[PDB]
Design a protein around this ligand. Structure first.
Ligand code: RS2
Ligand code: CA
Ligand code: CA
Ligand code: CA
Ligand code: ZN
Ligand code: ZN
Length: 157
């Protein structure tokens, strides 16, 4: 987990798959879920290192956790920590979207950010932290998600 509830994040590169604005939308919208229920606060920075580093990549991409091309593995984030910790990586061999068609960025990002903050997968099929991609018109967290994060960072209110 993170010591400070005030965290910075930065979209290092953008998937051309979408117009960058929608990319920022899907991200900020991802960070909101978690901010909506915990004392966590997020500031995106446009340059320099940030706590949560966000990037879209492929295959071997430095870290010892290479992507497998289209399909299969979609994304992976790192548990809270300096440097690589809290960092989230997206698989560019995927066709990232801002809609119902396969691999909706927002949805996956939300999940990834969950790991960035410390969370593990959920056994609740209805939780965002559940390890299987599925698309839902509304995308709010499950009781499971909220409970999970609030025991870590407390509650908002
Ligand atoms: O959990 C993972 C890796 C997986 S995955 O790529 O299929 C995957 C699955 C779902 C996911 O995020 C979502 C979670 C729930 C609904 C939508 C998206 C994000 C990644 C592939 C290996 O097994 C676990 C799921 N990364 O964080
Ligand atoms: Ca980091
Ligand atoms: Ca892949
Ligand atoms: Ca792509
Ligand atoms: Zn990676
Ligand atoms: Zn996951």
């Amino acid at each position: 987990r993170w010591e400070q509830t005030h965290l910075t994040y930065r979209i290092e590169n953008y998937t051309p798959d979408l117009p960058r604005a929608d990319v920022d939308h899907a991200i900020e919208k991802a960070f909101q879920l978690w901010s909506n229920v915990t004392p966590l606060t997020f500031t995106k920075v446009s340059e320099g290192q940030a706590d949560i580093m966000i990037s879209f990549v492929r295959g071997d991409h430095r870290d010892n956790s290479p992507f497998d091309g289209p399909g299969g593995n979609l994304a992976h984030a790192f548990q809270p920590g300096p440097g690589i910790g809290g960092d989230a990586h997206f698989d560019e061999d995927e066709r990232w979207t801002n809609n119902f068609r396969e691999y909706n960025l927002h949805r996956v990002a939300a999940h990834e950010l969950g790991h960035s903050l410390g969370l593990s997968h959920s056994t609740d099929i209805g939780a965002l932290m559940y390890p299987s991609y599925t698309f839902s018109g509304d995308v709010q967290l499950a009781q499971d998600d909220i409970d999970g994060i609030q025991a870590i960072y407390g509650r908002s209110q």
